[model samples]
Target chain A: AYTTFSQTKNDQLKEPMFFGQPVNVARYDQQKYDIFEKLIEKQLSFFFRPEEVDVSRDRIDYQALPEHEKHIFISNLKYQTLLESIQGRSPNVALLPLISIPELETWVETWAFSETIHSRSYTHIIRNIVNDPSVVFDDIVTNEQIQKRAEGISSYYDELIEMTSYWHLLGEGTHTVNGKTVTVSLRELKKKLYLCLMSVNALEAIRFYVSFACSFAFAERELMEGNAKIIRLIARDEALHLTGTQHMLNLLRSGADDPEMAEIAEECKQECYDLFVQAAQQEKDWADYLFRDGSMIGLNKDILCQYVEYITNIRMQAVGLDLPFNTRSNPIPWINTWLV
Target chain B: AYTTFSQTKNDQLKEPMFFGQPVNVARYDQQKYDIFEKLIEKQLSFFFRPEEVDVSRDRIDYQALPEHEKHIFISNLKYQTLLESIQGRSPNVALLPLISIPELETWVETWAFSETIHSRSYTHIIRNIVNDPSVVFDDIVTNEQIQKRAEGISSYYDELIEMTSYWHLLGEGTHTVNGKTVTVSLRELKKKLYLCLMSVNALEAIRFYVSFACSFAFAERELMEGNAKIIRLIARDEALHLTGTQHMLNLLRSGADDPEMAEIAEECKQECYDLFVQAAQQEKDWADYLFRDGSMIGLNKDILCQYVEYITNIRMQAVGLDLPFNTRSNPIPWINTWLV
Candidate 1:
């Protein structure tokens, strides 16, 4: 038993992996998963204090871009803007309560908290890069390509969270109220959770890397390094986030807790592969849209598309997907220089 | 429309209190509630790095205590360990998703994050003062006095969160699943939320203050000033947390948005009064348990019982409740000197 502010003495690790305990204490003295604690410490150590980025050069580079390149640049930015906005709070909002371990609980909060700083960095970038950021931000939700991809990414969390409320409140039961019946079982809920983590993997692995390429593409030409600087910080964080999800997936697949989960993982492997590819294709479409008006120097429709497939193949293999695409080389090796 | 780690344009202040719109963006550029922002600034301003609390002297003092007084001091500290443990993370876990306004969302995160520091302080204190910290931490869950209060607190949150899940997922309607009928409505959900906030208020306002008074009583006799320093830091934070719950209660009672809340406030008013009175009774009982073997010079069962009513009345009035008892003036006003 735990309160919103519970005073219970339950050890977080002894609880089920999720939802068995309402983490009564925020502690890292002992962690079920030390990875989360390590991540938290790494994040704290890399805490850049938020004032290091200087957009003074971008203030001028932004003014000199042709109207068409300006459109490409700002729209790419608006898309990155949406990604961080959701991530800034979603991990804590979506994952905090269900987490039974203290290290993971604080890690989720710390991860979400870091995204807020990333979101703030956008304001810093926009205030310098554009005379009016409201114009850039106004179109983010309204833009069809951004909205289309956002729905795909956020829907998993939305759906899983919807089911979690019932699972937590009603428990695994069939109950009658107001003349209707409702069923909430833990197995079904855990399946939903497994799929949700896969969706998150697709987002971090496929979607985020595509955006990072865009920001880095500009930096490749030694322009907009200010914006690139912020993106690098975000990418670094995503590396940890992606690694965290990979561990969770691997953990579940190994039958770490419920063997049903490992079965679910096996059953969903094909769907998960397809989802990764679907995300890659979606980014390829986004790349076309980004360069739709006109191509910037050293970045065009073809190369950006190749970057998508190359990254997808790399990420998919990392998460245990056999090579589904034939891409053996970096489509743009100079991109690596910008990333580092 | 918001995806992970992004911001878009939407007016947050204009959104309904809950479940109306996704926070399209996370920006502190503007706010609907300056009180939340003020709280964040105040918390940041009030930061005293935990290591700064010099508690090594208390280790010697603790070693010198008579067996019964040692029992009193250690049990009180252990009880505190239990309270901050829940408080440090639960607010973020439970409140962040329901929050629509950006400032309040961030403030909730900041507030909860601060509690982790307090929890850590307890560990720091225990390690310095005791031979084995786990002896105290281990008993926190099993101790009958602590266990009874923990259940009372967690059940409110569990109910509030349960309703929140249903309302978020299905919206307002009657539905059937597994041959059972269920009715889910926003109004009912809001009422539970009101009660949950009241429960939290009773905790920080009454229970935490009772614990603080006991910690400070030792300092009055110049026994354990080092331990008192840490308690003082915790007291300062409890003051802010108490202020937060008071504001939430007042806002709901006034039906600042939903007029029905004013009616619900009336419905819950008497229950809220009794809840505080009962918590005071429990604290007095706990005091008897703490001092069963022997009494420290400055604190005993009788004085703690009086302090319970004294602080309970002040807390009740702050949240728009009539004082249910002829509460005496604080018998230990000087105890507050350490609180400052």
Candidate 2:
């Protein structure tokens, strides 16, 4: 039922963003959503290789750092590595089977592929700074703090993938399996997709930027400039990715493609709000660990937590969610200098 | 159960290509298979945009052609569009769920993403040549000949996806699914994955090159040179894609990754041979339809059939399958001049 090439001659322009007829022809001559097509072109234009950024000098700089500063730097990197590892493969695995528009489908693939380049960039930075790269790579899964954060991020995708498989295979209805009745409904699946997109939006919008602040703080001290440059490129690409998800969420909520999706968005608003607040609190908790050794110059646990609140409010409001944190101005204005 | 981020700290260098443990950290400082890492680097260096090519002159050139010549050009394009449509989506959908290593996983995503660029190139070429692009894109699903070919190429992916969903959702055991007793076995699932890789190899190795012959034939007369230029780049990328898949199959057959996969490869040898033969014959029959109206100067039914026979043997023997066709040399040697 979920064939890659569905034999249906339908007007693709009229199909909804998802759960419509599966795209039969991969055409970019036109698009139902021009934003996705534009995003695809934008991402391609930003193509880069991490090896092009020389991080050799960072080895000496990293070794000269104090022990607490080293902990903050390596831990932040390990967190970024874990995020990219999931982003590298999750979108295509969870979303490709459900996409119905060519532009959106290709955008998802292109977005995920760009994340792989980010994953490679981490390996590049890790190898140059540390004598044994395996220590940093191996600790990502065993680190309790990272594992807790990982559970929050991956649970949404895992749930969506499992439900999508049932929806694709058994389809919409209650069926007896192993003497228990399991129900699969398209409306329920659509809601799950909505919540997943919102979760992804928070991850890209709030979670990634919090870590970016840590990366840039070292460079503010004129240390690890090469690592900062590579991460700057990643931040540029990530800004585009978050926009892609935001557009998707906004479009779904506005009922441009599917009215049922708009309804699902409204119905899931409370869940969405709770998810964002939970992620913000998690970021605040992580800030405590990053500064547990001691406070660094120009940045501390308080400033990082404030930035989390500030960014979370802006991102949540952009997608039409109520501000979970008190409205505030940018807490760390200097991070913008390194963003580009 | 399937997970986007598996919280396991196992040594990734020791993990097999598939079904060992899902990749948790996407680190590339080390790789179990260096070929995949090399392929990813090669593909990234070859990144291109279809819009960079100037196809404006092809419009006038296409309109000035004889009716039979136009038929040859458009039909060949419709076939290319169909193949790319399937290729653009199938790899990520069928392969991502089972991959356990980081390098191979990224290679699969990189390989699939490049096909989307090929799809975009067709749209660029078609929109310039035809008055209405919908007339061409819409026919890809309803066109009988293209539909027949799509079935053969997509069936393997569809079958693998279906079986994989069941395996991920329910572990290997006898269970009642929707009131029907179903049995899932890891050994059988591995066999499906093996055969599916062979089918993909044939698609990339034989199906793509045949269409390239038709595109290059038009250029031999100094027509549609822009389209040829774009296809030249596509061929260059496709060459790498086929190499990646071939290396995967060879590695599995040699027991480099898993002994069970090697046993499954041996068991599926006859099925793999038949699959390649069936695809080769289908291409031959397609050649008859392609030239039923008339033959061009450099390429025709006889030359295409001979080329099909010639390439099929080499591709089959690369993966240890018995050659289904007699030995033959390249029928149209000039096609190599444009392959780069």
Candidate 3:
């Protein structure tokens, strides 16, 4: 049975990354995967508070924007807030139950906690700029554009969590509930986790980076420099998070930790590719919605869509999937100044 | 159905602390409970790294100890590791699903993340002190003394997590599963949550404070000063953690957020009292085991037992529970110098 403290004494290095036994002793002297320990160390080294950066001047800059530019800026910030809100809670909810390694388990928690800081950064920026923070916060759930984006991001985590409950409660068998026969397969469950990791990797690699370009675009013109400063810190932490998912995907696919996970990766390859393409398309659609009023001086729907295609290809190929789109050079070369 | 991103447009300020809807947006501009938001801010300000402390001298100090003194010191460190291993993951896994407010949800994640740093501190200290760190880490699971302590600490979290899965899957009603009938009630679930919070409070308040006394005892002799330095930082963060749980328990009992929770708290007061008594007794038994060989100069079985009773009464009284032990003064006053 799944338990918080599995009492069977065994070598943790011999266990699988997941579904072997729940980790009982949280020891880090040795690890089945060392990357996770390194990531945890790096995340601790990068500890920060959003309030450390001054976003006071951004209130004035935000008020002076043209109507169309204001629409682009505020909508983009709202979408970033929505992304962090989901990322802040989803990984721990979806992944912690199945992890069997101490290092990886702690990494999942550390990664999720850093996103909460990012969520706080959004609130800091929003409260300074907006007259009523509730109007902006409330619209995150009700606005059709934001809700649509939320749907694309949260569906994988939601499905994984649901199936995981079934797997944890009734392990890998057919069961009857209310005159209905339900089959729970561990193989299929692993496949779900595999695809879910791909979805998460796509989220960090492509979706978040796209939002970063918009945040930096404002700073390009020497406006909203305070908001951009805070975003720069978020971007720095996100780079480590993106690397974490990439390692998990690669490790599972390479059969280094679990051979079955390798098969799951192979089986879900096309599904993973399709998921990445779908996410890129959604971002493109969001770009159109964001620029519906009009484009800002330095960013437009056309340029943003191109960046999506370029980043999607690189992120997909990093996990051994075929590139989904023709690769192109960076459109906004000036944005690199903001990223570490 | 439970969802990672709930689409309901309800105002978050109107939702109860738990079992309302799951938090959809991670906004901190407003809070149903402002204490949680303030705790999050304070914890982020208290961020630290274990490696920053100079534990290089601890190896020599540990090498110089007698056998009985070594047993007392190493066993105490092992128990601290066990407590943190469970604390680091239990709250997020058990409580995240039921949380309905954005501020409290982030606070739980932040609290858990800080414990992982404590976990890392143990590994850092162990690696510096012992020749084979694996020997000490292995005893954490195999030693009878350590495993017995783990059972009392983990059972509350394990039960809450199991009931939560059912609540999420089957909602509230009687149901048949595989030819067995079981009932899931919201009131019973709320009672389970209340007791679990009490168990957790006992962990942070009594269990951790006892271990801090041991670490500071060595520093009192000017031995293992480096280990004490890191623990000094840990105690600072833990003070905030204990405050967080105490606030939640008090708020629930006072009927500030949920009136039904107030009734449930009243109904379960005796059970809550028994839980603290059981935890205190277990800690006393652990004290006997820790000093079975011989007592250190500053700490021993009798002194540790008296300290357990002393802290237990204070922590229990903080939540309106009847005192189980006669009021006593601090048995180890030197620990006050280390705690923030």
Candidate 4:
């Protein structure tokens, strides 16, 4: 069920987004949906080296800042690092075995590889700003706020991966595990994947934009412009990633790709909303940490929270999920200038 | 143990290559083995777009060749495509979960992503030369000879992934499944990884070079120069991948990373030897099928077979295995011009 190249010579265009057949014959001559291929092409065109971005001025700018602004800036950097660290490898680990089409498989890989670049950007930012990078990197784990988000965000991916291992090993049926009756259902596993994708979508569509708002706010003051330059590139790619996940969710819910996934998507719609709200709540909490010392010039906890709600409302509308927060216009209209 | 970002916050420097704890912070500030970091840097520097390479003239050149040379050329393309199809995602799916260090984790993803480029190159080559791409693609699975190699090459990866699924789910202990006991051991799983890496090394080191010889043969006569150009880029990357796997095998066997892996390496020495010999023999048989119609300008069955034995001896000696073939030097010294 989980071989790298399933030897059946199946038509990839007919396969679902997940769990129909393992992909063989990786070909880009055609695709079931060309959006993923477009994403891959767009992503390849968007490639950049973090080291190539000159963060030299960032070091001087960071050192001259007040402690409170330093807290906000460095804390936001830490949060971005943690998010990229999880994203850097999780999609490939949790999604690759389940993807049945060549284009989606390659997209998942390209998506993860790009995050590794983002992860590298964080390292570059840290090394330039701080004398000892360890002082920042070592805190990513022990920090109470960071670990909470890491545990919650990684929970969905971890559970999905565990259930997938069982499905691949024991097939779909009730199984005995240490005197517990474990029933593994394909439909239920499909639900697990659906919710997982929802959480991933929320992470990209909401959380990353929130981080971008913070980064670009400093750049608006002509501070940390190099860091903002890299963040803007990251935001560009996240838009594509957000599009990829939204399309997958919409296709599944619409019954365009898999009838079973459409059914699962319907059953799991409320769970998907909760996942989005949870992600928004975490980002709001993260905003508190980033501004715990004091609010910077252009961004604050209240403003960042409002922006999260604004982005969340629009992202939900795209996937056909019921809007959780009151719909509102953009709080940070200037972010669009950089995002563009 | 298998979480994407393990919350324990252990020092990544002390972690083994596999199965210590899942990586949390994706930082490249330090590495346990700088070779992987170097490989990642080199690989990123080597990135290229397949679409940029024009294969327009190959369509005209392909038709001008005789039927037998056409047979040899197309068959080799099919085999290269097959090798890449397996490689494109296998490293990410099979190795990402088990890797413990940040550098190796990103390297594996980077390595797999490069193979996807190679996979795309085949689509570009085939789309230009063949009227219907599916006519060539659909045959990849149905061809008796191609499937034989695919099945054999995929077998080791298949078995290792299966065992990894069980290990991640059940941990290192005995378990009851369907009235039978299933014992999952870390040591045994490490052995599975060791043998799998050996097979993967042979694929890159020997099988790919064999295919390269066939590719450069046509370019030796300037028949399909564009295809050979793309093949040269792929060969350049495969050399890095081969170096990656060879270093992994060498490190595991040398007791530098994991002592248990060293013991397993010694115990599985004979199995590793047989895997390499089997890969060489398969390439030999493939040579027979490739030249079955007739010989081309600079390549034939017997000469290809001799080159296989020569390359096999060199690859095995690098791994410190008992040399299986007779001692020899390069049968095609001119191939070195293309390789470099």
lDDT of 3 by residue, B12-56 (tens): 898998899999999988888899999998988888778888988
**lDDT value for candidate 1?**
0.75
Could you tell me the lDDT of residue A212 within candidate 1? 78
After superposition, the stretches of candidate 3 with alpha carbons farther than 4 Å from their true spots are none
The better-scoring model by DockQ among 2 and 3 is 2
Instruction: Put down candidate 3 lDDT per residue, A15-89, tens digits, no spaces.
Output: 888888899889888898899999988887777777778888888898999988888888889889999999999
What's the TM for model 3?
Answer: 0.98
lDDT of 1 by residue, B1-340 (tens): 2222233456677765544465776665556667776786677556565666888899899889899989988888878887787776667656766777766777777787677768777877887887877677778777887777877877787777766666666678886645556688877887888887898899988888899888888898898888888888888988888888888778768867557877988987888888878888888889878988989888888888888888888888888889876967789989868875
DockQ of 3: 0.82
Tell me the tens digit of each residue's lDDT in model 4 across B278-336.
99999999887888888988899989999999999999999989899889889999999
Task: Report the number of clashing residue pairs per model.
Answer: 24, 0, 0, 0
Q: Ten-residue segment with the worst summed lDDT in candidate 2 chain B?
A: B146-155
Query: Residue by residue across B58-77, what tens digits does model 2's lDDT show?
Result: 99889998888898899989
CA lDDT of each prediction against the hidden true structure? 0.75, 0.91, 0.88, 0.90
Off by over 4 Å in 2: none
Clashing pairs in 4: none
Give candidate 4's error at residue A90 in angstroms.
0.7
Candidate 3 chain B weakest ten by summed lDDT: B147-156
DockQ (0 to 1) for model 1: 0.37
Give the runs in model 4 whose Cα sits over 4 Å from its true position: none
Please give, for residues A1-340, the per-residue lDDT of candidate 2 as tens digits: 6889888799889989898888889999899889999999999999999999999999999999989989999989999999999998999999999999899999999999999999999999999999999889999999988777899889999999999999988999998878898999999999989988998999999889999999999899989999999999999999999999999999999988789999989988899999999999998999888889997888899999999999999999999999987888899999889775
Give the per-residue lDDT of model 1 (tens digit) for A1-340. 2236444457666665665666655554567778877887777555553446999999788788777777778877887778777777777766776777777777777677777667767877887777776677777767887877666667777667666766665667886644557688877787778777787787777787777777787787778878888888778888888888888888778877557888888887888887887777777777657877888777788887777888888888777877677866887887676553
